[PDB]
Every structure is written in structure tokens, then in C-alpha cells.
Amino acid sequence: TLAQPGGISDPNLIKLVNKLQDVFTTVGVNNPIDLPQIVVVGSQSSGASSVLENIVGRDFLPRGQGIVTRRPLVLQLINRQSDERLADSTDKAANLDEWGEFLHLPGQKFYDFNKIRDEINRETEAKVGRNAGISPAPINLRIYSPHVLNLTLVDLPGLTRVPVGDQPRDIERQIRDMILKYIQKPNAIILAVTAANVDLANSDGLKLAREVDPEGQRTIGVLTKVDLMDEGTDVVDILAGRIIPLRLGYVPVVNRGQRDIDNKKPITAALEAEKAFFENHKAYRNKSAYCGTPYLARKLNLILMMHIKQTLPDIKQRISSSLQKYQQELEAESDYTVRRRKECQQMVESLQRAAEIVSQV
Amino acid sequence: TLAQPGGISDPNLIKLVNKLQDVFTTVGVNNPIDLPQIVVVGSQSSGASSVLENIVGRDFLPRGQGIVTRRPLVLQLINRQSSDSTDKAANLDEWGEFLHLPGQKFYDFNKIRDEINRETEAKVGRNAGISPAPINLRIYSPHVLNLTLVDLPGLTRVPVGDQPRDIERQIRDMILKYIQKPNAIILAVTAANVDLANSDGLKLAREVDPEGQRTIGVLTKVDLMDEGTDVVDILAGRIIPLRLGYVPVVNRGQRDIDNKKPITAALEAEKAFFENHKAYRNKSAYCGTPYLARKLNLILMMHIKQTLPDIKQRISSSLQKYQQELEALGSDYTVRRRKECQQMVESLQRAAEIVSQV
Ligand SMILES: Nc1nc2c(ncn2[C@@H]2O[C@H](COP(=O)(O)OP(=O)(O)CP(=O)(O)O)[C@@H](O)[C@H]2O)c(=O)[nH]1
Ligand SMILES: Nc1nc2c(ncn2[C@@H]2O[C@H](COP(=O)(O)OP(=O)(O)CP(=O)(O)O)[C@@H](O)[C@H]2O)c(=O)[nH]1
Ligand SMILES: [Mg+2]
Numbered sequence: 001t002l003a004q005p006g007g008i009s010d011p012n013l014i015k016l017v018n019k020l021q022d023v024f025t026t027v028g029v030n031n032p033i034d035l036p037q038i039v040v041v042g043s044q045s046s047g048a049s050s051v052l053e054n055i056v057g058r059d060f061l062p063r064g065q066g067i068v069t070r071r072p073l074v075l076q077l078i079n080r081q082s083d084e085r086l087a088d089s090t091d092k093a094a095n096l097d098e099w100g101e102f103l104h105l106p107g108q109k110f111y112d113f114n115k116i117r118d119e120i121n122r123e124t125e126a127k128v129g130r131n132a133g134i135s136p137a138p139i140n141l142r143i144y145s146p147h148v149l150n151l152t153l154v155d156l157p158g159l160t161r162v163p164v165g166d167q168p169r170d171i172e173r174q175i176r177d178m179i180l181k182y183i184q185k186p187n188a189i190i191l192a193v194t195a196a197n198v199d200l201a202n203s204d205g206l207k208l209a210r211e212v213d214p215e216g217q218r219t220i221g222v223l224t225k226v227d228l229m230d231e232g233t234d235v236v237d238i239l240a241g242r243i244i245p246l247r248l249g250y251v252p253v254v255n256r257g258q259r260d261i262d263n264k265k266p267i268t269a270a271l272e273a274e275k276a277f278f279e280n281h282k283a284y285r286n287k288s289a290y291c292g293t294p295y296l297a298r299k300l301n302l303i304l305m306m307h308i309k310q311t312l313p314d315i316k317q318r319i320s321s322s323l324q325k326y327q328q329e330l331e332a333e334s335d336y337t338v339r340r341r342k343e344c345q346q347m348v349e350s351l352q353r354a355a356e357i358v359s360q361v
Numbered sequence: 362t363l364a365q366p367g368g369i370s371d372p373n374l375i376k377l378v379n380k381l382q383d384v385f386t387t388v389g390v391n392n393p394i395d396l397p398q399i400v401v402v403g404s405q406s407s408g409a410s411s412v413l414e415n416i417v418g419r420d421f422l423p424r425g426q427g428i429v430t431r432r433p434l435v436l437q438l439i440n441r442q443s444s445d446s447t448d449k450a451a452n453l454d455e456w457g458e459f460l461h462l463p464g465q466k467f468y469d470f471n472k473i474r475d476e477i478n479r480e481t482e483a484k485v486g487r488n489a490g491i492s493p494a495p496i497n498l499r500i501y502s503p504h505v506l507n508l509t510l511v512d513l514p515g516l517t518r519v520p521v522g523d524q525p526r527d528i529e530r531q532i533r534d535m536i537l538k539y540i541q542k543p544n545a546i547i548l549a550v551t552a553a554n555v556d557l558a559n560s561d562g563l564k565l566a567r568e569v570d571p572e573g574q575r576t577i578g579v580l581t582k583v584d585l586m587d588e589g590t591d592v593v594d595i596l597a598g599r600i601i602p603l604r605l606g607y608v609p610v611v612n613r614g615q616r617d618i619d620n621k622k623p624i625t626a627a628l629e630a631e632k633a634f635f636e637n638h639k640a641y642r643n644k645s646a647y648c649g650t651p652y653l654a655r656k657l658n659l660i661l662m663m664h665i666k667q668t669l670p671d672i673k674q675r676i677s678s679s680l681q682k683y684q685q686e687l688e689a690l691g692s693d694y695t696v697r698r699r700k701e702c703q704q705m706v707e708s709l710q711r712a713a714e715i716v717s718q719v
């Protein structure tokens with residue numbers, strides 16, 4: 001189950017959105033909650049696909065050596081309330097409440113997230129072959145679950161310097177222009193991913209994020225590969241804010257190495273290895289709870305909570321002003337007058353009830 | 362001493378060049394030996410300064426964390442036959458002189474290192490500033506060629522400290538100055554712990570050497586790779602191929618630098634790493650500073666030998682001319698003249714002999 005306390009699929013965050021959708025319906029608004037997209041951006045092989053996969057909480061994105069992500073993967077998470085059909089699933093988490101559908105495969109359902117991964121590899125090769133070609137044409141994936149928000153996440157090819165295989169001379173500009181399409185949207189949280197085993201000032205993720213978000217208002221820095229740093233080096237000076245500071249700060253993570261991927265090590269054991277690495281390192285033992293994938297998921301949870309609560313002032317205003325109106329209108333008699341007193345009274349009670357639910361956030 | 366068999370300061374290479382230069386000057390023939398400059402280029406913190414240091418064979422370049430090389434270091438190695446130090450290799454035959462300190466001599470290569478740090482701070486301070494103004498260093502030794510080597514600031518993407526918004530273009534323009542020269546070997550330095558497609562060293566090298574004819578890829582930090590990864594596919598030529606190929610190396614890590622580990626122990630650690638690694642054990646002769654040194658030695662040897670046919674031609678045609686003049690003389694003036702022409706013919710014979718041996 002993709003339910004994960006603390007993260008973007010925190011049960012309380014789902015409960016909050018359902019409660020507000022019930023309020024909006026009774027007060028007569030189409031739900032105005034506009035959740036930002038989450039977009040990962042960095043140099044090629046910074047570990048972007050692994051960071052995005054960890055936020056979703058189940059494996060489905062191709063990860064490996066060489067050039068892997070060669071088309072945008074636009075994932076729509078869609079909230080949907082709810083056996084032989086899982087005969088020869090290889091996915092131990094596979095269940096009838098959660099599946100994927102690809103736009104390019106109408107009516108096919110993937111309960112097995114390994115098959116989602118296989119399909120992303122196949123659809124990539126169908127359009128751009130097996131010699132490093134890249135296309136801006138997105139692969140559109142929807143994932144249905146009772147435990148997710150209505151939210152878009154984007155995985156993107158990494159920025160490169162040197163064309164390989166079938167890539168043209170100007171591949172760097174083409175990947176730069178493809179990425180700007182997704183992060184120029186003011187409603188986009190930019191996860192600027194940089195490998196900790198390169199100097200931060202070489203980060204293409206940070207350079208691009210600073211071009212479109214110079215105030216650093218929707219950019220979180222992610223430092224991958226902290227386990228691969230030269231002995232006695234660390235990212236503490238970056239976390240302490242002394243080097244390219246970001247308003248929203250940086251989170252160091254340790255994802256699976258290529259040996260873990262080849263050994264098919266599961267996400268849960270990878271999360272436990274990451275906790276142990278940070279609790280046992282001299283330099284990260286201090287405030288170790290601010291290290292790792294769970295802290296990045298928490299940062300995102302809080303931003304998403306700020307977006308939902310950002311709507312309440314406007315709503316409190318509309319509730320009280322329509323409450324005042326019906327109370328004034330509410331000052332033997334005709335079929336009209338009796339019916340209208342009843343409708344106005346039913347309305348007053350809903351707006352009281354709505355006002356109560358909004359106060360208790 | 363800085364003499365190192367197999368590298369750019371191979372004693373046989375020094376002997377050969379001095380012998381030919383003595384011939385050219387004694388017989389009146391233009392010296393065509395034009396040795397390329399050797400220029401290191403890469404991303405900031407790829408390990409460029411350490412690769413250049415290892416080619417010279419004694420420590421003198423600032424290395425460490427953050428932005429370290431912040432001005433060009435143009436080193437002229439100059440061959441010179443001889444007549445309170447903290448440097449155990451210090452000797453009266455080998456010293457450095459900086460243009461900006463005229464007539465000061467540094468026998469202690471630690472002091473050379475200290476002076477590069479001080480002259481860097483004097484012009485661009487201690488908050489990451491960068492200048493294209495070179496620090497000009499000459500190193501005098503009986504054991505070196507007349508050879509120019511250049512260390513350069515790394516290419517960066519994001520300005521830090523005092524750096525201006527357009528620092529990337531300024532560093533790119535400063536580097537192109539040195540590698541646009543067709544007579545430059547480009548050492549494109551890339552950390553092995555990033556995918557080669559991210560190499561700024563290879564991107565810049567490809568702008569001036571698109572055919573990849575004068576570029577050696579150097580892969581540093583092979584000791585820092587993700588467990589079970591290796592650079593074998595790059596060494597096998599299957600990824601951005603270069604005529605002159607790639608050399609993997611392992612330099613001192615920051616802990617080695619903090620512990621002041623000497624160059625000799627670092628070269629022995631590198632040899633053991635490659636002899637003992639699953640992926641490199643059968644190919645260890647193609648690994649390390651010594652293989653990079655050998656590649657450079659061989660290129661230099663090809664340039665010297667490439668000139669000899671043209672030279673043999675000019676020597677014999679000069680010999681033919683003096684022989685014709687001498688046969689013209691066949692009275693105290695006449696006898697002196699016959700002797701001078703005879704002495705001249707013998708020089709060119711002798712010269713022709715010495716060149717044929719090679
Ligand atoms: N040791 C270690 N290896 C990591 C880490 N994160 C990712 N890797 C390794 O880096 C490689 C790239 O992982 P990946 O998620 O595919 O990176 P990416 O940036 O998406 C690759 P592309 O840009 O081509 O899509 C894999 O070999 C993976 O195991 C990390 O935190 N630690
Ligand atoms: N483990 C390991 N660390 C390396 C390697 N080469 C260099 N380092 C480390 O990388 C850092 C940079 O080394 P340095 O030689 O100064 O690199 P650079 O590219 O010249 C730095 P700048 O671009 O700022 O001048 C130092 O901490 C050094 O010890 C290597 O092969 N292995
Ligand atoms: Mg990827």
C-alpha cells in the first residue's frame with residue numbers, strides 16, 4: 001500500500017483534502033486546491049529517478065548506469081476509493097486497489113510495478129532506440145490508489161555536456177529547453193539533485209533552478225551519493241547554509257548503488273541502510289533526523305500542507321459573508337415563504353457545519 | 362632528482378634532445394624540435410592540479426577541497442647542466458624562479474607551493490575570486506626537457522563567493538587561450554565517479570580538437586567509484602573514443618593531503634590499487650600515472666623522430682654545397698681557405714653520422 005506516514009501520501013493529508021472537498025461541495029465551489037507538480041532536475045547520473053521513486057514509495061522507474069531516462073515521465077497520482085488477476089505478479093506489494101495506466105496503452109491496467117518499469121523501458125526504445133537518443137515527447141502514466149493525492153510528478157533526462165551515440169551536437173540545449181518547459185511553471189516544486197561526490201558549484205540542477213526560481217522559494221537541494229564521498233569529506237558546510245544557500249535548504253540522501261540494483265535489494269532495506277549510514281557517521285550523527293529520504297518526504301508534506309491551508313482564508317470569508325446573507329434573508333403564510341424559510345435554514349446549518357470543519361484544521 | 366625513466370623527464374629523451382641541439386648549432390641548421398605544451402583541463406575539483414604534479418614528479422601545486430587553482434600556472438621546465446629546507450629532495454642543481462620574484466631561487470618545492478598560494482591571494486583574495494593573469498614559474502634541472510605545462514582553474518556552473526554572474530564564460534575563455542594552440546596536448550581530466558557525458562574537460566577538448574587527435578582522457582578518483590562499477594568500457598574505446606585513449610589514475614585523497622603523505626608512497630598506493638582490483642589486475646600496465654607519463658614520453662619521441670628525415674636532407678645538401686666550394690679550391694689566403702672549408706666538410710660529415718645513429 002502506497003500509504004506512507006510523514007510523506008506525500010500521509011493518511012492525514014488525504015483525510016484533510018477529503019474533508020475540504022466535502023466543505024467545498026456543501027458551499028458550492030469547484031475544489032480550488034491547486035497542488036504543485038514535483039519535478040526532479042540535475043546532471044545525468046545524479047540519481048534523479050531514484051529520488052523520485054523514493055517519494056512515491058514503490059519501485060517503478062528505470063535506474064542504472066549510462067543514460068537511462070531519455071523521455072519525460074509525467075506521473076499523475078489519482079485518488080480512487082475501492083485474487084486470480086494477480087497470478088504471476090512479481091510485485092509483493094501488488095493489490096486490486098492500486099494500478100498504473102499509460103495513455104499510449106488505453107484500457108491496460110498494471111498491478112505489477114515491475115511491469116510499469118518494463119513498459120517505460122520499452123516505450124523509451126520504441127521512440128528513441130537503444131543508442132542514447134532523447135525526445136521531449138512525455139510518457140504519460142496515471143497511478144490509481146485510495147492512499148494518494150491528485151498530484152503530478154515529473155522525471156526528466158539529466159543535463160549532459162558531451163553528446164553520445166545518436167545524440168546531436170546541440171543535445172545540451174535540447175535537454176535544457178525540455179527541462180525549462182516543466183520548471184518555469186510557478187506551480188512546480190524543483191528538486192535540484194546533485195551528487196555529493198561532485199563540487200556543488202558544478203550542479204546543473206542548481207544553475208537551472210536558480211534561473212527560474214532565483215529567490216529559492218520552490219527549490220529543495222537534494223545531495224545524493226553521500227556514501228561515495230572521499231573519506232573525511234562531508235556536506236555539513238552545505239547543510240549549514242555556507243555554500244549556495246537555499247531558503248528551503250538541502251537534504252542529503254543515500255539511495256541504492258548499482259550493486260543493490262543488480263541484487264534487487266528492496267526499498268525498505270534501502271531506507272534502513274540510509275538511516276544506519278546517517279546515525280553511524282561522525283559528521284551526520286548530529287540532528288540525523290534532518291538526513292535521508294524520510295526528511296525530504298516530510299519537507300514535501302509540509303509544503304503541500306501550506307498549499308492546502310493557503311486556501312482557507314478566502315473560504316472563511318465566503319462562508320461568513322454567505323452565512324450573514326442567509327441569516328438576514330431568514331426574517332399562516334404562502335407555499336413560497338414556508339419553502340424559502342426551510343431552504344434558508346438548511347443552508348444556515350450547512351454553513352455553520354462548514355465553518356466548524358474549517359476552524360478544526 | 363626530477364629524473365624519472367619512462368616519463369617526460371626520461372634521461373634518454375634529455376640526452377637525445379641535447380645531442381641534436383648541439384649538432385644543429387655546430388652545423389648552422391634550424392632546430393625543428395617544437396615540443397607541444399601539456400595543458401590540464403576539467404571541471405572544478407576533477408583532480409587536475411594532482412595529475413599535473415604527478416607528471417613533474419615532485420610536489421609543488423596547491424591541492425585540496427573547494428576552489429584551489431584560481432589563476433593559470435604556466436610552468437617552463439628548463440634544462441640546465443650544473444657547475445633550513447623542509448624538502449628532502451632539495452639540491453643545488455634544481456630550483457624554481459617566479460617572474461614576479463626576479464632572482465629569488467626556491468630549492469624547497471614546499472616554498473614554491475606556499476608562494477603560489479600567496480601570489481594567488483595577493484591578486485584574487487580568499488573568497489573564490491579568479492583571474493586570467495598567469496603565475497609564471499621556471500624550474501631549472503639537468504634532468505628536464507625545455508617544456509611548458511599549464512594548470513588552470515576548473516570549469517564551474519554556479520558563481521560562489523566574489524565570483525561574478527558570468528564566471529563560467531570567463532573560465533571557458535581563459536582555458537581556450539591555452540588549448541586552441543594546435544601544438545597543445547590536452548589532458549581532459551574527469552572524475553571517474555561521474556558519467557563521462559558530464560565531462561567539461563571532454564566538452565572543451567572537443568570544441569578545439571573535435572577529431573580527438575591531441576586529447577588524452579584522464580579518469581581520476583577511480584578509488585571513489587560505486588562498488589562493482591569500473592571504467593573498463595571507457596578504456597576499451599566503447600564510450601567517446603579518443604585516438605590517444607584514456608588513463609585511469611588514483612591520486613591522494615583529502616586525508617592523505619591532511620596527513621602530508623609523500624608522492625612516492627601515493628604512486629605505490631596507486632600501483633597496489635590497480636594490481637589488486639578485480640577489473641584492472643590483468644590490465645594494470647595501462648593504469649596509473651606511469652602509463653600517462655609513458656603516453657606523453659611516446660608522443661614527444663614521435664615529434665622528435667618525425668623531424669629527422671627533413672634534417673638528414675638539409676645536412677647532406679649543406680655538406681654537398683661545402684664539398685663543391687672545396688673542390689673549387691683544388692696564396693697564404695688560398696691555403697687558409699682550403700683548411701677552413703675542409704674543417705667545415707668534416708663537421709657536416711660528423712653531424713650526418715650522429716643523426717643517422719638515432
Ligand atoms: N552509492 C550510491 N549510488 C547511487 C545513489 N543514487 C543513485 N546511485 C546510482 O547512480 C546510478 C544512477 O541512478 P539513477 O536513479 O538512475 O540516476 P539518474 O540521474 O536518474 C540517471 P539518468 O540521468 O540517465 O536518468 C545508478 O547506478 C544508481 O545505483 C546513492 O545515493 N548512492
Ligand atoms: N580519493 C581521491 N581523491 C582525489 C583524487 N584526486 C584528487 N582527489 C582529491 O580531490 C580534491 C581536489 O584535488 P586537486 O588536485 O586540487 O583538484 P583540482 O581539480 O585541481 C581543484 P581546482 O579545480 O579547485 O584547482 C582534493 O581533496 C584531493 O585530495 C583521487 O584520485 N582520489
Ligand atoms: Mg533517471
Ligand SMILES: [Mg+2]
Nearest residue numbers: 409410429430
Ligand atoms: Mg587545481
